[PDB]
């Protein structure tokens, strides 16, 4: 379930690389993900060209897990899903409440 198939998912990735890798794209709301640990939560690298100080903008959103039914993973005590793709899917549309949610998943 490494979602190693989502334009946004990035395995073995690090918060440091996803920014650089995401920055390479230059998308507004670029979205990426990186596996972590714990209950099995995944990381989400979201970046959107916009940072007078240091642009573009790349944020790392981790998918928290909450033994639900399924409502397990989530990033903001907002909406917890049974997987990053879904959790990403909802962030790819719903519009979450971050830089710009899954505006555009980015993978390296």
Swiss-Prot record:
Top-rank taxon of the source lineage equals Eukaryota
Q: Which residues form the SH2 domain?
A: 8-106
Q: What induces its synthesis?
A: Through a myriad of surface receptors including the TCR/CD3 signaling complex, coreceptors, or chemokine receptors.
Q: What happens when the gene is disrupted?
A: Mice display decreased mature thymocytes and elicit profound defect in CD4+ and CD8+ T-cell development. Additionally, they show a strong decrease of cytokine production in response to TCR receptor stimulation. Impaired TCR-mediated calcium response in gamma-delta T-cells. Loss of Vgamma2-positive immature thymocyte-specific transcriptomic profile, although there is no change to overall transcription factor expression levels. Not required for the generation of IL17A expressing gamma-delta T-cells.
What is the annotated localization of this protein? Cytoplasm; Nucleus
> What does the PTM comment of the record read?
Ubiquitinated.
- Where do the coiled-coil regions begin and end? none
**In which tissues does this protein get expressed?**
Is detected in the thymus, lymph node and very faintly in the spleen, but is not detected in the liver, lung, kidney, heart, brain, intestine or testis. Expressed in T-lymphocytes and mast cells. It may also be expressed in natural killer cells.
Per the entry, what this protein does is: Tyrosine kinase that plays an essential role in regulation of the adaptive immune response. Regulates the development, function and differentiation of conventional T-cells and nonconventional NKT-cells. When antigen presenting cells (APC) activate T-cell receptor (TCR), a series of phosphorylation lead to the recruitment of ITK to the cell membrane, in the vicinity of the stimulated TCR receptor, where it is phosphorylated by LCK. Phosphorylation leads to ITK autophosphorylation and full activation.
Family as reported in the entry's similarity comment:
Belongs to the protein kinase superfamily. Tyr protein kinase family. TEC subfamily.
* UniProt domain comment: The N-terminal PH domain allows ITK to be recruited to the plasma membrane by an activated PI3 kinase. This domain also contains a proline-rich region (PRR). The adjoining domain is a SH3 domain, which binds to PRR (from itself or from other proteins). Next, a SH2 domain is required for binding tyrosine-phosphorylated substrates. In the C-terminal region, the kinase domain is required for tyrosine phosphorylation.
Subunit relationships? Homooligomerizes; this association negatively regulates kinase activity. Interacts with PPIA/CYPA; this interaction regulates TCR signal strength via a proline-directed conformational switch in ITK. Interacts with THEMIS. Interacts with FASLG. Interacts with VAV1; this interaction is important for VAV1 localization and TCR-induced actin polarization. Interacts with TBX21.
The molecule here is called Tyrosine-protein kinase ITK/TSK
**Gene that this polypeptide is encoded by:** Itk
């Amino acid at each position: 379930n490494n979602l190693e198939t989502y334009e946004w998912y990035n395995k073995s990735i690090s918060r440091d690389k996803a920014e650089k890798l995401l920055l390479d794209t230059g998308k507004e709301g670029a979205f990426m993900v990186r596996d972590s640990r714990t209950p099995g939560t995944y990381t989400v690298s979201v970046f959107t060209k916009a940072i007078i100080s240091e642009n573009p903008c790349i944020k790392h959103y981790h998918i928290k897990e909450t033994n639900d039914s399924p409502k397990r993973y989530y990033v903001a005590e907002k909406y917890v899903f049974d997987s990053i793709p879904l959790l990403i899917q909802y962030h790819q549309y719903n519009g979450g409440g971050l830089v710009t949610r899954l505006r555009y998943p980015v993978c390296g």
